[PDB]
Amino acid sequence: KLPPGWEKAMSRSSGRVYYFNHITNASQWERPSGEPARVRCSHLLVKHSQSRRPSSWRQEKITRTKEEALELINGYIQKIKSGEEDFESLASQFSDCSSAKARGDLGAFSRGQMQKPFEDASFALRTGEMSGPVFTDSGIHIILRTE
């Protein structure tokens, strides 16, 4: 019926159907459009206290909670989706990953290289598409597939 990971859902606040992807955590009102050996993605990472390494170039000791990190991710998504900000601008300013310095770009990668929730989300994204919050042992990610 729908592209990999995508399902129909029901809006509580509007009663209108929407689309949810249980691999990427994306959600949108519009029906999704229409697998490669490699994808290329950028990401914005927000780390927290349970991160595999609770440290980043932004913060020597990262002390926020999983919940606080998810709310930040939720605010970044709202700003990207509203057009108030662009993904790679926010990655450069606020990503807790060292790829912040390359506007969140991680380069191309195959299956078997990244942490799997990330790998799965990345490969279920089409070029140009963004994920919702993706949880890994590094923290919470927003993922943009670029190639």
Ligand X SMILES: CC(=O)c1cc[nH]n1
Q: Which residues lie near ligand X (CB under 6 A)?
A: 80, 86-87, 128, 130, 144
Query: Smallest distance, Å, CB 142 to ligand X?
Result: 8
Tell me which of 42, 56, 95, 138 is the catalytic residue. Answer: 138
Tell me which of 43, 48, 122, 131 is the catalytic residue. Answer: 43
Give whichever of 71 and 105 is closer to ligand X, judged by the CB atom: 105
Q: Which helix (H) or strand (E) holds 66?
A: helix 66-82
Q: What does the DSSP assignment read for 46-58?
A: E--TTSSS---SS
86 phi/psi in degrees, rounded to 5: -100, 155
Catalytic (active site) residue 41: no
Sign of CA dihedral 86, 126, 27, 95: negative
Tell me which of 41, 42, 48, 97 is the catalytic residue. Answer: 97
Give whichever of 66 and 79 is closer to ligand X, judged by the CB atom: 79
Q: Give residue numbers after which the chain breaks (C–N above 2.5 Å).
A: 34
Nearest residue by C-beta to ligand X? 130
The catalytic site residues sit at: 43, 97, 115, 138, 141
